[PDB]
A paper describes a structure:
In this study, we identified the function of LpSOGP, determined its crystal structure, which is the first one among phosphorylases acting on β-linked glucan, and clarified the binding modes of substrates. In addition, LpSOGP did not show phosphorolytic activity toward cellobiose or laminaribiose. These results indicate that LpSOGP is highly specific to SopNs, as LiSOGP is, and is completely different from other GH94 enzymes in substrate specificity. The tertiary structure consists of four domains: two N-terminal β-sandwich domains (residues 1–257, yellow, Ndom1; and 295–553, light blue, Ndom2), a catalytic (α/α)6 barrel domain (593–1020, green), and a β sheet domain (magenta). Ndom1 is unique to LpSOGP, being missing in CBP, ChBP, and CBAP.
Author numbering: 1 to 1113
């Protein structure tokens, strides 16, 4: 069987514009030249995100009615460039006329007829303003670069928007406004129009009041306009309009195109405008959200609760002894970003895995999005989650339940419980609880949905599935066959998947008594519209399940007879315990809260890190799939080195070196690590150092110099294919080091900035910046890396090792010679020649508002490159200029913003949204601050810094932080500033905590893996070396008497901390009162810890496994 693909049946065309609509008149794709104007495509059940609303005001009520789309119940006629909606709302007759002109200009002409005392209209339009590929790839990211300017025109507010991130080399533009009626209020973001409360009510919050008339630059670009209120006694007519320009290189300064708009407004189509049939939903009600639970209910279902978060006495979230995190309904209605989770199948932790199965889900009834096997972009069964507020609620697997006469879609539950193995939703119904579970199977490529009525009451259900079978919905036909209760789905020939994973298929085991259809069952006349919405109707059951299987290589296995969550939960618990070497902090008295938070979060961060590594995608950042070259070298390698997964790291490193690029001999920015030959051959200037640093760290930890002799291929730049001309890794390293020599600025060993550094928003805006900038951070990283490489290679290739020592010395010399003035390391040097040099991000740059950069200050400490006196100064600088209650910031003032055009840095000057790196508290960099503090032995600061970015009970620790999902990593902390100008003007509020801050994108980051390393390796001080253990704690008095359980060289040991500032020596380690012999570690800033031989350590542990660590902090 072949499932057809959805094509929008209403197609309007004019000149260079094609605007398509679904049969109810919902926007599908609005394209002008090569720019997509809407942000979200409509779907056949929800409609689209845009609308026009008529509101009617009475003495005892306010009412609101959509005039367009499938929910208006409007009749429709179309022409070649015109669409006419007709209907009535209460006693008012309306017609809406959509006109697409030849001028990249459209109109919504509204005519109202009847009698009423007071009414208004609200125009509502979600906007993308990018290429189709950019919009579909990440609407959130696109919106961050869409800068809005607000003006007063002839008819009140007009909204002009410029896309600041280049789209096919163009900077596209929109203008929206009203004609013939005043727009007296406006808004620009979805969170302002729909509100968080939508996630429960399904009603846009703005419809009960007046728009705020503020421009919020966030991630849901969404234009709304509210008309003046009016009376009707007869017929009244007015319009909204839009203008799209594909290229607007200047910044916006005023309302433009006034003459074109006037001409366009006179345009009408000559053709006949004829009726079309509108399929209508039948017995489908509004969505169903659970009622909230009270205290007794919560206590009954969750009698054992830890780390409880309460606001105004309402419980918002908590953790359980079974290592779950539970979120109550009220918390979702306060968090701007939706609570969610990623499930992933276990794999063999000695090798880089392939074919890992993953699924995503969210609290508001998205039970299974983006089901994948291996590649998270291409090897996909179910569509990706999009947006934030679940206005479009079709993606993946969704559930309708019949309540009264109507099927109603499940949305927001009373509670949502997450475990590394699965998610559970609790919906309170009238005298029953429906429990929905979505969970991963252990040792099998499967995700399981289970539905169960707690009272064993029967219901009717429809479970919908937005299939892709390939990278995207609505792109290609799908093969579907059935044998009994088993469905098999596989891609048709044109799909890219089909080419590199020709045996890829999925299977679903469905319930015995169900019926299968597409969306036809939702409609009064049974018309199929979307043929790839796979709908399963299940009648009168009190429970059922759906089991999903993924096979990238065709290794089809039978279904089990029984699918039990509890057994998977126990097996995943053990798997994660082993991953973190049975980490557990304990004390005889009450454990300190910081230890309690670590015990609660560590497996969550291990799960996040494991996803980042093996199935790369996030909640917001659903498009990943590849390894970032610098990223795999950080989060995953640091996590695995910390925990002793050395075989895994070796394989990672071999894989990584095989992706080095022939001819250039640097690495791509990112690459697929599976059979898809896809990479980004253009890279930042820091990227080349990471694989060099990582191999060195591995060699130092393990002694495994054999890796250097492995024969490994390269990849071609344009094609990403193997060259089949392998060389030893040692020679890979030599070629990479040659590229580094070639970066020297003439007469120096200063490394040119080239494509940029760690901060992806700081790409140079022109070629001269590319050649003549030097990043002090890059310079420092280069010194660190070449020294590590020197040591790693010393016993293998004497000469190469000597040359690395000299290069490192030269680089170190240039760092001290050029990049430091008045004791302050400059962020950058701009050098045309010895005669023409200037600092940036240094106090000497008196023309700039930016005088200090974090990165060089931490990197120079971590590398032990900064001498003691300089390092001390770096810390004073951080404290005075960079330290905030929500963490340390990246620079002491924001980057330039002047309407979206770049002068020095690219994305930093283009982002209209205060978020991500632009927030200046990008949590990954704060984690490196912690690594620097640990290097200096500064325990009080280091532990305080660890807690400032720990999501558990964050709002109690950082009083100006807004609450966020407590069991997942957050990537950034951003002040609640509506735009870049207010951010620059009141930046100092961040220092003092006089503005609230909120969390950024979730889960997918190097952050979790590196945080884990800070905890274990740098603070608790347990590190592994070649046949040695290093014990080097940086702990506060609070850890006195606390014990760590940790598995070392396969043996579980217990490390008890005694913190004694009066001791003679810096550290002493005892077991059964015997002092362990060892040698002192090297550290230029403080007394180092101790290195103990593996055999001595293990021999001691066999006798008595409780090691006592006496340390003077
Ligand atoms: Ca104590």
């Amino acid at each position: 069987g072949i499932l057809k693909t959805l094509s929008a049946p209403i197609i309007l065309e004019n000149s260079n514009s094609t605007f398509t609509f679904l049969p109810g008149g919902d926007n599908f794709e609005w394209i002008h030249e090569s720019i997509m104007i809407n942000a979200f495509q409509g779907n056949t059940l929800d409609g689209s995100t845009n609308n026009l609303y008529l509101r009617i005001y009475k003495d005892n009520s306010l009412a609101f009615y959509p005039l367009i789309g499938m929910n208006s119940k409007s009749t429709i006629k179309s022409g070649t460039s015109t669409l006419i909606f007709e209907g009535t709302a209460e006693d008012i007759s309306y017609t809406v006329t959509f006109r697409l002109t030849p001028y990249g200009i459209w109109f919504w002409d509204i005519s109202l007829s009847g009698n009423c005392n007071k009414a208004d209209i609200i125009y509502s339009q979600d906007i993308g303003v990018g290429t189709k590929g950019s919009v579909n790839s990440n609407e959130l990211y696109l919106a961050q670069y869409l800068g809005h300017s607000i003006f007063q025109g002839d008819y009140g507010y007009v909204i002009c928007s410029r896309q600041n991130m280049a789209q096919g080399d163009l900077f596209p533009y929109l203008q929206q406004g009203s004609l013939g009626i005043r727009s007296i209020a406006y808004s620009t973001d979805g969170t302002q129009f729909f509100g968080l409360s939508y996630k429960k009510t399904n009603i846009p919050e703005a419809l009960y009041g007046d728009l705020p008339s503020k421009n919020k630059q966030y991630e849901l670009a969404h234009t709304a306009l509210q008309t003046e209120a009016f009376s009707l006694s007869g017929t009244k007519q007015f319009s909204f309009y839009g203008i799209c320009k594909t290229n607007h290189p200047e910044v916006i300064r005023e309302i433009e195109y006034i003459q074109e708009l006037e001409k366009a407004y006179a345009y009408h189509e000559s053709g006949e405008i004829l009726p079309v049939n509108v399929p209508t939903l039948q017995n489908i009600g509004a969505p169903y959200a659970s009622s909230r639970w009270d205290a007794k209910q919560v206590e009954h279902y969750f009698p054992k609760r830890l780390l409880e978060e309460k606001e105004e006495e309402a419980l918002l979230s908590f953790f359980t002894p079974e290592k779950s995190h539970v979120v109550l309904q009220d918390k979702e209605l306060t968090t701007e970003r939706p609570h969610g989770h990623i499930l992933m199948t276990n794999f063999d932790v000695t090798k880089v895995p392939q074919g890992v199965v993953s699924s995503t889900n969210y609290m508001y009834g998205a039970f299974n999005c983006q089901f994948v096997v291996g590649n998270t972009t291409y090897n996909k069964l179910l569509s990706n989650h999009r947006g934030l507020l679940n206005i479009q609620k079709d993606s993946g697997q969704r559930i309708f339940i019949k309540i009264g006469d109507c099927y109603r879609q499940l949305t927001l539950p009373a509670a949502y419980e997450m475990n590394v193995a699965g998610s559970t939703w609790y919906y309170q119904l009238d005298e029953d609880v429906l429990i929905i579970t979505s969970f991963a199977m252990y040792n099998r490529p499967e995700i399981v949905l289970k539905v169960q009525s707690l009272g064993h009451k029967k219901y009717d259900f429809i479970v919908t599935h937005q299939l892709t079978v390939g990278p995207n919905e609505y792109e290609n036909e799908i093969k579907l066959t059935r044998e009994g209760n088993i469905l098999q789905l596989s891609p048709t020939d044109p799909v890219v998947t089909n080419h590199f994973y020709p045996e890829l298929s999925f299977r679903m085991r469905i319930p015995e008594d169900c019926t299968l259809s597409d969306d036809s069952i939702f409609f009064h006349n049974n018309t199929t519209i979307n043929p790839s919405l796979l709908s399963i109707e299940i009648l009168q059951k009190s429970s059922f399940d759906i089991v999903m299987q993924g096979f990238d290589t065709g290794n089809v296995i039978p279904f089990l007879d029984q699918y039990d969550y509890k057994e998977q939960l126990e097996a995943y618990r053990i798997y994660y315990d082993q991953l973190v070497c049975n980490f557990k902090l304990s004390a005889p008295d009450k454990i300190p809260l910081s230890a309690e938070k670590l015990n609660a979060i560590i497996h969550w961060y291990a799960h996040d890190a494991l996803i980042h590594f093996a199935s790369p995608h996030g909640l917001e950042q659903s498009g990943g799939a590849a390894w970032g070259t610098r990223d795999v070298c950080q989060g995953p390698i640091e996590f695995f080195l910390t925990t002793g997964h050395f075989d895994l790291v070796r394989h990672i490193l071999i894989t990584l070196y095989s992706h080095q690029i022939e001819g250039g001999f640097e690495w791509p920015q990112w690459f697929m690590f599976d059979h898809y030959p896809i990479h980004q051959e253009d890279c930042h200037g820091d990227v080349v150092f990471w694989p060099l640093k990582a191999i060195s760290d591995y060699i130092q930890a393990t002694g495994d110099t054999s890796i250097l002799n492995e024969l490994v291929d390269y990849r071609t730049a344009k094609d990403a294919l193997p060259t089949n001309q392998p060389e030893t890794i040692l020679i890979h390293i030599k070629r990479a080091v040659t590229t580094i020599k070639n970066r020297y600025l003439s007469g120096t060993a200063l490394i040119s900035y080239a494509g940029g550094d760690w901060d992806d928003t700081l790409q140079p805006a022109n070629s001269e910046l590319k050649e003549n900038l030097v990043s002090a951070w890059t310079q420092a990283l280069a010194e660190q890396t070449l020294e590590l490489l020197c040591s790693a290679i010393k016993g293998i290739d004497h000469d190469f090792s000597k040359e690395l020592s000299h290069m490192a010395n030269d680089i170190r010399t240039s760092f001290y010679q050029y990049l430091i003035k008045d004791g302050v390391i400059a962020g950058f040097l701009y050098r045309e020649s010895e005669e023409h040099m200037k600092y940036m991000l240094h106090p000497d740059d008196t023309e700039s508002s930016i005088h200090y950069r974090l990165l060089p200050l931490t990197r120079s400490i971590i590398a032990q490159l900064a001498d003691f006196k300089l390092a001390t100064r770096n810390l004073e600088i951080i404290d005075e200029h960079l330290a905030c209650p929500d963490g340390v910031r990246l620079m002491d003032h924001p980057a330039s913003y002047s309407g979206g055009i770049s002068k020095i840095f690219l994305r930093a000057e283009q982002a209209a949204n205060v978020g991500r790196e632009i927030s200046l508290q990008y949590v990954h960099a704060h984690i490196r601050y912690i690594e620097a503090l640990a290097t200096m032995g500064l325990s009080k600061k280091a532990w305080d810094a660890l807690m400032r970015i720990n999501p558990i009970l964050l709002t109690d620790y950082v009083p100006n932080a807004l609450t966020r999902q407590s069991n997942v990593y957050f990537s950034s902390s951003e002040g609640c500033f509506d735009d870049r100008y207010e951010y620059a003007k009141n930046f100092d509020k961040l220092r003092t905590g006089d503005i609230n801050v909120k969390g950024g994108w979730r889960l997918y980051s190097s952050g979790p893996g590196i945080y884990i390393r800070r905890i274990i390796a740098d603070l608790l001080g347990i590190r592994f070396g070649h046949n040695v253990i290093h014990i080097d704690p940086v702990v506060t008095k609070e850890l006195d008497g606390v014990t760590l359980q940790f598995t070392c060289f396969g043996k579980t040991v217990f490390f008890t901390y005694h913190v004694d500032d009066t001791m003679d020596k810096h550290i002493c380690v005892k077991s059964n009162n015997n002092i362990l012999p060892g040698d002192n570690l090297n550290n230029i800033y403080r007394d180092g810890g101790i290195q103990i031989a593996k055999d001595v350590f293990l021999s001691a542990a066999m006798s008595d496994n409780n090691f006592h660590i006496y340390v003077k902090n």
